[model samples]
Target: GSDLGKKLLEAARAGQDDEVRILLANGADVNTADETGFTPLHLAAWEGHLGIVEVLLKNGADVNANDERGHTPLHLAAYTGHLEIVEVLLKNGAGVNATDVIGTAPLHLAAMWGHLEIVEVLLKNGAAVGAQDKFGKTPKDLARDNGNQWIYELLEKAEKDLRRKLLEAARAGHREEVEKLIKLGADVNTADETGFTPLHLAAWEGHLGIVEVLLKNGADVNANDERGHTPLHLAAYTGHLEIVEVLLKNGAGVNATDVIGTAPLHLAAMWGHLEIVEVLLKNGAAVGAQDKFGKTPKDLARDNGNQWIYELLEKAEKDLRRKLLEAARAGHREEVEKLIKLGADVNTADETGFTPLHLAAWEGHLGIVEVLLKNGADVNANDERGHTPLHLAAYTGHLEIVEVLLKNGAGVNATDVIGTAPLHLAAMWGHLEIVEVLLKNGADVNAQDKFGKTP
Candidate 1:
């Protein structure tokens, strides 16, 4: 059944010139279609046999005939990487960009097969990269989608000289050449749609050599190529220490926070670069800086747990504590006498109201309290919160100091702004010893506080 058609199909597939002529001469129609709707010339052209195609074409075979899916002889010639047949087809006026019924052209086939030489021929024959298939795949995009990076690169190269030249000019810092390309319709900021501008590359290399060229040519300094990092931020974060310094000094806001609100100081401290830290600090950077997670510089150092840096921070903390405690307790005589002898600040009553005598009296060190009272502490000096050393002595039940304080003209009823007298708080807290001492020192047995509680 259908022996001659099968024989003719097989003869065409093998490019059998004599058999093909015999099949046609024996009434095997030259236009006989196979399962793929292929004619003899389609198979012959696809196999790159110029002799077979010449015989078929001379036998009146339709040179422009298509397949079941409308792939024409040109599409078939391109599919097999048959450059010779492709040239013959073009020379014979077979359309170089002949489309299938669905509009896919020969170039689409060439791109898929990675047929580099055939692709050059087809594109030279007016094939359009922008011509899309039914699925909207352009020839260039089809080459890429075929996963043939080599062909993708080749097609990319063959289509646009200016795109490559622009990249070359950007790399070489030939600003004048680059400008000429731009004037000649070159894309200055062209990226493959990933937004990776040429400026991004120059900045990444710290190519200060080429970077200014891009900047002068209008590359975006603040443009975040694809990873969400701006030029300055990337330079800062990559520990390109000089690049970071240059950017910052040239009006990059050192205070500018990144996508995470991390400033340059954070970046330097994060990498543990002492020199960078010193530079940022000298520029009035926040020493107590916090990141998005609210960690301060010292907090970050603490989190890092580095021995030397933590020690440095600890020493800084100790020095700060010393300064905060260094004022205005010089007049407390007894406290001053011991502290002076022991080298404690005669003036150290912190903002919290604790003087050396408060320490001395509350600790029941009668001797130290006497030394402080003798050294001229205000027997009644009220601390910021209005508590005196006498209040501490009464509250902690230091009976001996209560007596000494009363004898030294301590106000027995120096009722603090709070109406609670010594006896009231002492009685409430069951400080029976302090109540007895205050009574002996003539403190009022009945005194009231601002809250109107009696003692």
Candidate 2:
């Protein structure tokens, strides 16, 4: 058996294709390495025996078997400038980037030996152009030192093409290619001519795995395209619910507006992405945000016949209004202002017709009352009992509320359902200051209530 293995190695090295097959048929080991660890396939590849290399590889010859110097068949073929042998080894799954003992990969050997064709093959198979030998010299450095300017320029172009390739890989959902490009030092945030970053393309194309990979590599989550549409906007518009969630979890701006002032919520609503809309809303998307055309998300939903989204937005707005009323009543001035800014209607009232202004006046929150007025709360809006904010302010003895209400045009002689005017309430409550203020504002002293009782 040992003698037959030796003969097979010699036959493969000598390009004796028939003899190599005969030895294998006679129980010769195809992968027998010699004293220095050189296998028959290594000899065939180093000697440019393309047929022998194929025969040995077909008989289970190790495509990546390393010799004594840690050189695989690819390293020998690349260093020897055997272009056909290099292609054969690479086609048989040779480790294109496998390095020799001194840290020289096949790419380094190819560049150092001025094998431009072999260099192109290795690079096409994902050979790292920046692989450094033991002395810290990259393949490009070797090409430059050896005067192979063409190979040097080729490596330079490959490095520059990594960014462009990354964008293409992400857009096409090539997860492994994307990872390879990023590992090759491609800028994860590189944008194309249209300003679409890799993340933007991945998000727009609904490539969740690529999205995760790009994000893990520090891809800009908020990178926008030429239309000012961030990754989030594209994800929402394309109805990629999981990508939307991933982008949001990775700090994508949920309410980030595009060039048309259309937010993710607006796109989600327009496309009837129910779950995406819910996720966006949960992440604090402004329900009342209007686009450049003055259309809110709800309006888009309505126009698109997305009743569910419209209803959701409607409920969100109603909840905001209720919060506004509650904040006004509790004297949470900042909350009131914030809710108003969020588009909570200032004149929204509770079931009893008690508007925020009425609650603020009754609670004696002069600051809240003023905020409500400034935001266009109805000054003379009466409750179910026909009692205006003025009636409550006068009865509650908030003289400042009374003065501000009067300044904002609170009705001085407006009466409640029982014919009880603010003046009557002021006089009955014995708020001397409110009574005096009412009188000065021209309250009718001789006015009578339903019971004919005069103030």
Candidate 3:
């Protein structure tokens, strides 16, 4: 039974009219559903074979027969862009709004996949444009969301003229067309509906030559659309090395931040693009840059699960600290030792109230804590954030640092503006070990955060 069905299915799928006639003469079931529930008519409809489809329909083949995935012959006809077959199916009374298991209407499938001609035909045949999928995304939304401007523009006339030509030029990625367009006074700063500039579009496609051309023609390298992304950020995020080099060489702002305060270097490092990060760093991008979220390059590197990037960020931070503060932060003993050996300021203090001593003891760098104390560093210091070394250690659950700070005559009873004590924070965060340590050192256990929530 399976062998005879397979023969008939193959013949139908291939649209071999002679073979189908022979199979029919041999008493093979024309309506038999194969593994995919597609009979000969389904195959003919999918392949745009009007002659075969007509013969099958005349032979009592179910034009509305559906597959396991609820794909009817009409669905296949429209989905595969077989316009002629689709016309025939409609003429033969095929269902128009029949959907797949996922509730994908035949028109929805046509538009989502960007069959422009099939989509036009369907719309002309009364296909609704406002139908939505399970995710509440309409066919028009899906069409353009995937950068399919042709189909997306067809439904909405307001954006049709601009998007139709613009998306085509952007996707072509030809430097000559780009240059001609620029010389023709095309808007270099114009963005698509998604806030993607031509430079951003080119960089995303890894079109390095086109990127350079766009930049040379006064395209704002750091120009942001509605999404606040620049060409440099786009290149770095997508791992386009050549495009990144081009952008960097052409004076694209490497540290230019977006609306979220994310620099291109931050994007590269966050995406684990080590090579791109190196390129950005070598091009004078700030490795110690912090975001609006109070996260530094090092903070971004920390959770990226790669030690090399973290090390690079730390090294860069040390260099920056040396340049501005004239001293390394006190708590990193090894770091302090290295910076000391490198002739860094062991007592460096910037305007932000950070000292080598305040940095070290608060984070439990006992060895560095001892080194800073021995170097005559001030252990009791507060930054603009009003955090002491002991406060940092207790807040972050670094118990050993709390012990080290306590042993080195740190002010155990020190209070910040919010009046948070080290012991109070330790108990609140349930750092049982650090709570014990702070208790042994006579720290105030009842403390509160800015909200005044106490443990």
Candidate 4:
């Protein structure tokens, strides 16, 4: 039997296709190895004997048989750059990503020797381009190290294409497949060309379970995409309160801003999503933090006509002196009366220098402004930026508030810190009605600011 095994190896290695076929037909061990652990299939494939390889494989040769050094026939076939033999081995179910003792897969070996055809064949059989050998070098790295430009570029393209398959699997909520791919050495944080990670896709799609899985798999919760939008930013923008909470709990940066300096709180306020706004504020969202457009959460809520959101955001920015300011910002007439009776300062300016009257006039809260005027509030209270109630009322185009402030003896030509008058701001903002009101109230039509620009 030993003699028959030796003869089989000799015949297969010698490329004697007929004798190898006869020996296999006479009960020769198709997988029998020589003293150095070279099996008949291994030698045939390694020596580039195509017909003998076919015969050995047809006679029940193990396609993935590992020799003593853990070298499979497919590995040897690929290393020798035998295109036909490599194809035959792979077609017969050879392990494409299998690594030998030194963690060298067929891809690593083929790429190391600059076998472009064998490398292509291995890659076609699902070889891992990013698979690192024991020395931490990838097939592409080996190609580049060997100065094989074409092979290096070829493997680079393969690598660039492979991340998408895993990304697609993740987006489809294939939990098991994702885990399998990670075990197959897929990067957990691999971002696509546009910088969208699997976690970003999952968060955007509102896949709660998948989001949890990705987070558990060490995905970066705050990973920003191309627009600098982290998953938390998207979750808040999409109104996924639960996902927002999960991301927050997992160390997501709550105040992480995008390219336009718009944070999650800004998005929630912009979208008028009350629940998300509440969560963000509870988690300490900076309500007063303005975006690149200089619009705060309060500004966005007010502009969007979301009184409830505006009120919530106003209350979030709390100060003892700002209580009346908050009520006036929300147009809360009853609350304004109650706070005034409870000894809240109507003329008190908050941190931003906005008095109760300035907020009431800026928000066009007619009832609040009338109540404040009756309670001895300043008709011309100037904020930190030197913008008075009259300035804000005219600048915001609140005709009724402008009339009330003027009737209460407010300065129609009031200027801010930079000498910009109420008329200048009103005219610049195209508030035709406020312009008429300012001019009717005897405002200086030729008023100029620091830049000497006249209205």
Q: TM-score: which candidate is best?
A: 2
> Across residues 22-58, which tens digit of lDDT does each residue of candidate 1 receive?
8777887777788878877887876778888878777
After TM-score superposition, what is the CA distance of residue 65 in candidate 4 from its true location, in Å?
Answer: 1.7
Q: Write the per-residue lDDT of candidate 2 for residues 1-455, one digit (tens) a residue.
A: 56888898888778898999889998898889899998899889888888898888888999989878898988888888999989888888889889888998988888898988888888888888757788999898998999999999999898779978988898888999998887665778888888999999898898999999989988889988889999999999899999999999999988788898999999999999999989997887888789999999999999999999999999999998999988988999989888886678887878889999999999999999989988898998988899999999988899999999999998999978888998888887799988888888899888777899988
RMSD of each: 18.5, 8.5, 19.7, 15.2
Q: What is the lDDT for 113 in model 1?
A: 82
| Cα-based TM-score, every candidate | 0.34, 0.64, 0.38, 0.60
Which residue pairs in candidate 3 have backbone atoms (N, alpha carbon, C) closer than 3 angstroms, thus clashing? 327-345, 329-356, 330-356, 331-360, 362-389, 364-401
lDDT per model vs. reference: 0.66, 0.88, 0.73, 0.83
Candidate 4 local lDDT, residue 352:
84
lDDT: which is higher, 1 or 4? Answer: 4
Indicate the worst ten consecutive residues by lDDT in candidate 3: 324-333
Cα distance off (Å), candidate 4, residue 440: 58
* Collision count for each candidate, in order: 23, 0, 6, 0
Backbone clashes in model 4, listed as residue pairs:
none
- Winner on TM-score between 2 and 4 is 2
Locate the minimum summed-lDDT window of 10 residues in model 1. Answer: 323-332
